[PDB]
Amino acid sequence: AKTSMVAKQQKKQKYAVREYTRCERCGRPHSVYRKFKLCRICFRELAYKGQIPGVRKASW
Amino acid sequence: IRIRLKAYDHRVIDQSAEKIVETAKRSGADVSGPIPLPTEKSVYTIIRAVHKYKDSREQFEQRTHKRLIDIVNPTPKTVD
Amino acid sequence: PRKGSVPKRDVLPDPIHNSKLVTKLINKIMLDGKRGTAQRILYSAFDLVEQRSGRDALEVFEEAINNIMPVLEVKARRVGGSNYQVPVEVRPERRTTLGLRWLVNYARLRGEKTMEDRLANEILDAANNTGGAVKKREDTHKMAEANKAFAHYRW
Amino acid sequence: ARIAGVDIPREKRVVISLTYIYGIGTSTAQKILEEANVSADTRVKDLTDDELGRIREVVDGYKVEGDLRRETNLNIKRLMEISSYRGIRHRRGLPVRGQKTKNNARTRKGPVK
Amino acid sequence: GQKINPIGLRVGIIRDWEAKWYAEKDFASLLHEDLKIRKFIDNELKEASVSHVEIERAANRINIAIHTGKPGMVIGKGGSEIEKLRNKLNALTDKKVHINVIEIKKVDLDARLVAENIARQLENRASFRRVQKQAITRAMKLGAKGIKTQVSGRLGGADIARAEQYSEGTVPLHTLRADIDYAHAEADTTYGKLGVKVWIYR
Amino acid sequence: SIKKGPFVDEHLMKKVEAQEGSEKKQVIKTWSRRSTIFPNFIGHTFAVYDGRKHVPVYVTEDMVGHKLGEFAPTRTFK
Amino acid sequence: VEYRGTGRRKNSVARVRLVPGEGNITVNNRDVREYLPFESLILDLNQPFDVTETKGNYDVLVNVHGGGFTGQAQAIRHGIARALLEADPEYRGSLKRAGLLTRDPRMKERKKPGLKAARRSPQFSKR
RNA sequence: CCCUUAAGCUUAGUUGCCAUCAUUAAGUUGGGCACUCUAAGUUGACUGCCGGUGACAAACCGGAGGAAGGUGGGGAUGACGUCAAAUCAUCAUGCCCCUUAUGAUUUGGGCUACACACGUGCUACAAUGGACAAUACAAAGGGCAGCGAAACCGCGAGGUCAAGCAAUCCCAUAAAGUUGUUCUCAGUUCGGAUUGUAGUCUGCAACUCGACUACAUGAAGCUGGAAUCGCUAGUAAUCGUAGAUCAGCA
């Protein structure tokens, strides 16, 4: 599921690693990150206008 | 004491170095001056196309500024 | 490339051989980008050539280029209304820069087991005529030395 | 020529050039040189009368078999012929290995392209 | 067919990297609460004129500046509104304390409230044109170098709808150093789900 | 594989050793392919398949380094 | 006395002093021939002395570091030139009809993200 | 135009780069100098009349040029609109549907494994070349759950994961061009395909449910068709420290 597979993941299916990271307020299982706890098109909105700091679009 | 300096912009950590130096300078101590450090970065790349479109991808990351200072006079003049 | 007029863009420098043609062919024979390897093949494998082949490749480098470089070329150039090729004047950057690759495509020809010794055997039976390196030069150069074509063309 | 079956070639070194005869070859051949003065000589047709006697009495005393254990292939297959693996689910089912039986090329089990 | 977000590029450079803080150790979960408090003036305030938000916390000393929208009609009397706003903010544990106030002016100067405001008064079977052009003039009457407002989704009364973008000449976006800005209108009523576009020079 | 804890099942081998009272053979029925085995296996099938039944399997001195139903058919060529 | 022996090329710098008296360039307590892998061109790294008409002028006390070896050399095309230019201040108006006194020719670029190798991108299988 | 490199005043001239001091195994202990861009807040640039005129109709050429070709590579920058496609399927959708099955528990099974014909990314097809070996250089993720040093287990799909813990500081033979042990053209000590033995360690379970492999099974192979691969500087030839993603593996 996706709209009902939120507790299954972030509740305790009874092993160390059966939590597979998913976007905080979403259900997308692929393209995710722990310390961001979100995804691609369930996260991007933030570094527009600054809600994520020091994010220049280019020029490393 | 190895006090630390940490930031994400190129104007919030020069202030950190300078201003702790000055806080110690405003009162009597042979405290240390500005010791800058390089400008580091924290990358984060990820596909943007809502579908399976790729290779039209532009670099997307951030800049994590990390500086360091020593307080070379522990004093009861300007410590806190 | 809307324009052109590009040169060799290099100031050919040599180590301890004192030559300007022994440094423009060290990168051509340079097997899979091997500077020192080719540098040791141009100071120990190109110096012991006399011991194996017969003569040294020091001052006899001009006989391995001038006695093999062709003149008439074979490039399609429509002119008038037919379809006949026209040769380009053998210029320094179009005869010595392209006519100096007679050691990379001929290194895998000499069937004398040892490939390293076969690469040093390209100076023998090729410095003069009727050889295995000038055999492809006689099937090109000798093809328009008598049959003249257009002289008022562009190339 | 003498170690197992025959092995003819010359001009080369006897240390690992054993690869022909099953079970062992080259790698182990040059790594099993555990004897009294046996070594590669580059003269495969010289220098050898009785040294082979001892460094062969080992190969007979080398109870780890080699050719003699060519049949551990067949016999570990024999155990598995109940449709298990390597004999029933890999020999009685006519499939390939790599567990990509067929997405890439295959000549040894399927020799026909 | 692409003019991408200048909400998304002109950040830090002139308008500055909005989200502020480092935190030495607490990294993922001081942000696990930040979208819900930074977007708390657009979710529990019903997306009301919020022009931009912010987060600032190290040292366990959080404060957050915010327009407070257009103030006075939400605040009311004696201050018994924003005290309960703080009641709703910190009581997670200590989250989003002291969310201060500098007042904001001119509803028809800046695109942010205009966005969801013109996601409101077109779709009411009134000739959405007659009011489209109305708030087009009212915010290109001031004197900015234009606001190019246009409805991209589901105009008309008939079924098959297009993205008709009725813009008015010039409102830059390629002043890389200065700021151009997109405040968006994702609404609908009785009919489908609508799309509008807005671009201001300040 | 590793040594040190072959993973004899708790429930499953309980069902065995306490259903291995007599010679009566009730083997697995388990439609599960995860077990691990002892020397005291006594004549019976398994069910190492889940199509719409329960599959007889090898019983006597079968594959000896394994901890599952290595010999149990589900398919073949076609 | 010759100070400010400096000069870099391809992400690989050195700093090479020059000493009043004789001349011998010496990097990392080694020579112009026993620190570079074989690359028969040990006299070349000092042709900033043989475009100079005089070569044994000033001993170095040089130093190195870097990532590879090709970028490590061919910068000391300035390891002489910089300090040499400084002490001999005749060296701007008579040292370019060969091309020595200052050159700083090429450097690196960005490995493209998603492409095989910067210029190399996903090739076409067929059509 | 703001930026990635750039003579640069410098500056972190402490952990920084090592002429000055030889107190310098990466614990750059050191002057707490520099010696120089260097570790960026990078700062400059530009048609700069340019040496010319085209007979002039502007430009541009180039005398070599500021340390970077005429915008400083140029990074970012993306005309109307063509494209019924790019998403009903990772995302949000107006729309109606199976409703103790299409969901559902772990699964039996399965987007790898046939009876085959093609597209794939490089290492294949020895006389400087493997099974094999003394062994120069560190970039840059890192790491609050990670890497392993000098020495080192060198048989891999790493391990005790022991010590320095944001320029540094751990993967250190990083792989070659550096002397090149080793197999004189027989499928030959080139092989890591199957008919073989199977394995590094973190799994609630390798029979069809990936590996590449060493114990080395010695096969594809010796230049190429009706059928195929980089290209004016270090980009690729070849690999390369590793790993984002995540209890195995590019």
**Residue-by-residue DSSP string for G3-67:** -------SS--EE--BEESS----STTS-SSSSS-S-S-TTGGGGGGTTTT--SSEE---EE--S
φ/ψ region of D69 (left if φ > 0, alpha if ψ in -120 to 50, else beta) reads alpha
Whole-number Cα distances in Å, C109 to B70, C54, C106, C138: 70, 18, 5, 17
Note the Cα D98 to chain centre separation in Å.
21
Residues lying close to strand H (Cβ under 7 A), chosen from 2-31 of chain C, are 6, 9-10, 31
CB G113 within 8 A of CB B57: yes
| Rg, chain E, Cα only | 19
Asked if E124 and E194 touch (Cβ cutoff 8 Å), the reply is no
Cα separation, G13 vs G64, in Å, equals: 7
Residue B2 burial (CB < 10 Å; 0-12/13-18/19+)? Answer: exposed
**Region for residue D94 given its phi and psi (left: phi exceeds 0; alpha: psi -120 to 50; beta: otherwise):** left
User: Cα separation of D82 and D88, whole Å?
Assistant: 6
C94 Cβ contact list (under 8 Å, min separation 6): C88
Instruction: State both tokens at D65.
Output: 């078999």
User: Within an 8 Å CB–CB cutoff, is residue D76 touching chain F?
Assistant: no
Helix (H, G, I), strand (E, B) or coil at E102: coil
Mutation test of the interface with chain G: which of C12, C16, C30, choosing the one with the most G Cβ atoms within 10 A? C16
Parallel/antiparallel/unpaired status of strands B42-43 and B61-62: antiparallel
> Taking the CA atoms of chain G, what radius of gyration do you get in angstroms?
18
| Dist CA G111 CA B45 (whole Å) | 14
Beta carbons of G39 and G93 less than 8 angstroms apart: no
How far is CA F19 from each of CA F14, F16, F25, F27, F55, rounded to the nearest angstrom? 8, 5, 8, 9, 19
DSSP C92: G
Main-chain phi, psi angles of D68, to 5 degrees: -55, -35
User: Token digits for B67?
Assistant: 């500086």
The verdict on a CB contact (< 8 Å) between A49 and E38 is no
The pair of structure tokens assigned to F10 is 């708790």
Query: Which long-range contacts does B46-54 make (Cβ < 8 Å, 24+ apart)?
Result: B46/A31, B46/A40, B47/A31, B47/A40, B48/A40, B48/A41, B48/A44, B50/A41, B54/G114
Tell me the C-alpha distance between B49 and G32, whole Å: 54
* Secondary structure of chain A as H, E, C letters: CCCCCCHHHHCCCCCCCCCCCCCCCCCCCCCCECCCCECCCCCHHHCCCCCCCCCCCCCC
Tokens of C121: 């055997």
Three-state secondary structure call for residue B62: strand
* DSSP class of D31: T
Q: Which residues contact D1 (CB under 8 A, 6 or more apart)?
A: D7, D8
Name the amino acid, one letter, at E13.
I
For D66-103, give one letter per residue: b (16+ CB within 10 A) or e. beeeeeeeeeebebbebbbbebbbbebeeebeeeeeee
Which tokens go with A47? 């570094």
> What is the maximum span of chain G, computed from C-alpha positions, in angstroms?
71
Question: CA G29, G34, G36, G40: dihedral to nearest 10 degrees?
Answer: 150
Residue G61 CA to residue G26 CA, distance in Å, equals 6
Yes or no: say if E58 and E22 are a contact pair by the CB < 8 Å rule: yes
Q: Which nucleotide is nearest to D16 (CA to C1')?
A: H189
Number of Cβ atoms within 10 Å of the Cβ of F8: 15
Query: Which residue from E98, B10, E52 is spatially nearest to A51, judged by alpha carbons?
Result: E52
SS3 C134: coil
List phi, psi (to 5°) of E181: -150, 135
Residues 6+ apart with CB under 8 A from E112: E49, E50, E51, E52, E183
Residue type, D93: G
- Please state, in angstroms and rounded to a whole number, the distance separating the CA atoms of residues C118 and C103: 10
* Separation CA E186–CA E193 (nearest Å): 8
> Taking CB atoms and an 8 Å limit, are G122 and B45 in contact across chains?
no
The letter for the amino acid at E96 is K
E120 interfaces chain A, CB cutoff of 8 Å: no
DSSP per residue, D57-95: HHHHH--S-SSGGGHHHHHHHHHHTTTSSSSSSSSSS--
**Which DSSP symbol is given to B68?**
B
The set of chains that have 3 or more CB pairs under 8 A with G is: B, C
Q: How far apart are CA C140 and CA F23, in angstroms?
A: 95
Measured distance CA(C153)–CA(C147) in Å, rounded: 16
State the smallest CA–CA distance between residue G39 and chain C in angstroms.
5
Contact residues on chain B for G122, CB-CB shorter than 8 A: 55
CA nearest A43: which of A20, A25, A19, A16?
Answer: A25
Q: Which of residues 18-57 of A touch strand H (CB under 7 A)?
A: 18-21, 26-34, 39-42, 56-57
Residue D14's nearest nucleotide, by CA–C1', is: H189
G-interface mutation test, from C17, C30, C35, C41, most G Cβ less than 10 A away: C35
Q: Do chains F and E touch (3 or more CB pairs under 8 A)?
A: no
> What would the two tokens of residue G112 be?
């493209």
Q: Cα separation of B63 and B7, whole Å? A: 8
Q: Is A33 annotated to bind ligand?
A: no
Q: Which nucleotides of H are covered by protein (CB under 7 A)?
A: 1-8, 11-20, 22, 28, 32, 35-42, 64, 67-68, 73, 75-83, 86-87, 90-94, 103-110, 112-122, 126-128, 130-132, 136-139, 141-142, 144, 166-167, 174-180, 182-186, 188-201, 203-212, 214-220, 228-238, 240, 244-247
| Contact list, A36 vs chain E (CB under 8 Å) | 28
Residue E77 CA to residue E55 CA, distance in Å, equals: 28
How far apart are the C-alpha atoms of G114 and B56, rounded to whole Å?
9
Q: Are G38 and G78 in contact (CB under 8 A)?
A: no
Contact G100, G51 (CB under 8 A): yes
**B12 conformational bin, left if phi > 0, alpha if psi -120 to 50, beta if neither:** alpha
Residue A33: list chain B partners with CB under 8 A: 44
The residues near C7 (Cβ < 8 Å, ≥ 6 apart) are C93
Q: Are E200 and E110 in contact (CB under 8 A)?
A: yes
In chain C, what residues touch G47 (CB-CB under 8 Å)?
13
DSSP classification of residue G124? P
Backbone phi, then psi, for G84, in 5-degree steps?
-60, -50
**Interatomic CA distance for residues C75 and C69, integer angstroms:** 17
- Compute the 3-state secondary structure of chain F and give helix, strand, coil in percent, each to the nearest 5: 15, 0, 85
Cα separation, C98 vs E41, whole angstroms: 73
| Residue of chain E whose alpha carbon sits nearest to that of B4 | E24
Q: Which residue has the tokens 């004999």?
A: D87
B55 close contact with A: CB closer than 8 A: no
Task: Flag residues 83-122 of C with CB < 7 Å from strand H.
Answer: 113-119
- Subunits with 3+ C-beta pairs closer than 8 A to D: F
Contact across the interface for A40 and B48, Cβ inside 8 Å: yes
Nearest to G45 by CA among E61, G30, B56: G30
Query: DSSP assignment of E18-79, as one string?
Result: -S----SS--STTTTTTHHHHTHHHHSS-S-S--------STT--------SS-STTT-STT
Given in angstroms, what resolution was this structure solved at?
3.1
Q: Which string of b and e fits E167-179 if b means at least 16 CB within 10 Å?
A: eeeebebeeeeeb
Bridge partners of E151, per DSSP, are E196
The Cα C43–Cα E144 span in angstroms is: 76
D40 alpha carbon, distance to own chain's centre: 19
CA Rg, chain D, in Å?
Answer: 19
Rounded Cα–Cα distance for residues F66 and F75 (Å): 20
Contact G42/G36 with Cβ under 8 angstroms?
A: yes
- Is residue A56 part of an annotated ligand binding site? no
> What method was applied to determine this entry?
cryo-EM
C150 φψ region: left (φ > 0), alpha (ψ -120 to 50), beta (else): beta
Give F14-17 contacts, CB < 8 A, sequence gap 24+: none
**Contact in structure between E132 and E202 (CB atoms under 8 Å):** no
Amino acid code (one letter) for C141 = H
Asked if F31 reaches chain D (Cβ–Cβ under 8 Å), the answer is: no
Judging contacts by C-beta atoms under 8 Å, the chain D residues touching residue F76 are 93
Nucleotide nearest to D26 (CA to C1'): H189
Contact, C70 vs C141, CB < 8 A?
yes
